[PDB]
Amino acid sequence: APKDTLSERLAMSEGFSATFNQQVLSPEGKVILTGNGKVDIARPSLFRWETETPDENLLVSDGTTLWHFDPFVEQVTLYRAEEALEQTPFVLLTRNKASDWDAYHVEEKGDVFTLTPTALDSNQGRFQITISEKGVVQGFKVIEQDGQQSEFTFSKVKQQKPNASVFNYKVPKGVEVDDQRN
Amino acid sequence: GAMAPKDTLSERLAMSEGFSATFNQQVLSPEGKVILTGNGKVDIARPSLFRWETETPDENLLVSDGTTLWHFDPFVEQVTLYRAEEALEQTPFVLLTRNKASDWDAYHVEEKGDVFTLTPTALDSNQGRFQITISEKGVVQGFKVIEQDGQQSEFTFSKVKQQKPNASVFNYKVPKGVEVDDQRN
Ligand SMILES: [Zn+2]
Ligand SMILES: [Zn+2]
Ligand SMILES: [Zn+2]
Ligand SMILES: [Zn+2]
Ligand SMILES: [Zn+2]
Ligand SMILES: [Zn+2]
Ligand SMILES: [Zn+2]
């Protein structure tokens, strides 16, 4: 099955580190933004998404707190890691079992897996994960209902679980802290 | 598969007499960041026929009917004419129109899965390496032009129609008011 193929491929490694490039395309197909950064991901639930361009910022979850640090505005915002998917979709790359995909219909074409929300009332868009038969994640795409798509491609993949330390974010000096856990 | 790279690459290209598709381009610097994007559409009929219509970065048209290669630029409103048998001199895209082993005579070819890497056997070539990604069913997914210093111009195909375009698609007619730069020599 497609869900089982996706999950078994994600399960081949407990984590990875990589650089990424990003391209955002309008519904018309026009490039709106290009960006880049780095990622560390350990399964389940742990992700450290570091954006270099165009908006330098850090998003990091230890499975309990989701932190958002933006250096330009000297701000740290706190969220429940329970509500990660509401805030960011990158947490999908940290899944590793078929029951994690209950909200979606899954389809496979080669290494490309498309996850479509089951309900039709959805405002959420579809997702795509490109992952090799050896379990190497090649890309991730977020497609809005109106056709706008943000595309992430991974390179320089280190197919090893990052240390737990990488996700234990400490609030730094010189920032305001906005608690959004309640 | 990988023990006969040119035969496999040839057999896969021969699976369809042509295709049409949209394409998107990314150029990556030697340090791996995106420095340029583009898009357009392509029609290919095998052998030798191609129509590569670019929208970005520069809007322009390249089309060969096997005899004449036309390059039309709408900003300068000029079309240059070339001999089609020298198409490779002007564009690497003609490589997607091949379908037999003797067409890869100038290259060492490596197959790793669906990715075929074409390397000029001698280092002198101003051109660097080429990469064609094509399924076992013959569907071209992408094409890369790689420079020696690491820069890569990467093309990805989408909305593919695995069907031969009509021969009429490649019978370019020079539009009224366009200047003609004849290089057929
Ligand atoms: Zn994170
Ligand atoms: Zn709240
Ligand atoms: Zn053969
Ligand atoms: Zn055009
Ligand atoms: Zn132009
Ligand atoms: Zn060899
Ligand atoms: Zn005109």
Residue numbers in the entry:
A (entry chain B): 17 to 198
B (entry chain A): -2 to 0, 17 to 198
What text comes from the article?
In Gram-negative bacteria, N-terminal lipidation is a signal for protein trafficking from the inner membrane (IM) to the outer membrane (OM). The IM complex LolCDE extracts lipoproteins from the membrane and moves them to the chaperone LolA. The LolA-lipoprotein complex crosses the periplasm after which the lipoprotein is anchored to the OM. In γ-proteobacteria anchoring is assisted by the receptor LolB, while a corresponding protein has not been identified in other phyla.
The structure of LolA-PG was solved using single anomalous dispersion (SAD) on selenomethionine (SeMet) labelled protein whereas the structure of LolA-VC was determined with molecular replacement using a model obtained from Alphafold22. LolA from both P. gingivalis and V. cholerae consist of a large curved β-sheet comprising twelve β-strands. An Arg-Pro motif located on the turn between β2 and β3 is conserved in γ-proteobacterial LolA (Arg59, Pro60 in LolA-VC). A pairwise structural alignment to compare LolA-VC and LolA-PG, using the structural alignment tool in the protein data bank (rcsb.org), resulted in an r.m.s.d. of 2.8 Å calculated on 176 aa and a sequence identity of 18%. An electrostatic surface representation of LolA-VC and LolB-VC indeed show that the residues lining the LolA-VC cleft is mainly negatively charged whereas LolB-VC has a ring of positively charged residues around the opening. We used isothermal titration calorimetry (ITC) to investigate if the recombinant proteins LolA-VC and LolB-VC can interact without the presence of lipoprotein as has been reported for E. coli. The measurements showed that the two proteins indeed interact, with a dissociation constant (Kd) measured to 30.2 µM. We investigated this hypothesis experimentally by ITC and could conclude that LolA from both V. cholerae and P. gingivalis bind polymyxin B. LolA-PG shows higher affinity for polymyxin with a Kd of 14 µM compared with 56 µM for LolA-VC.
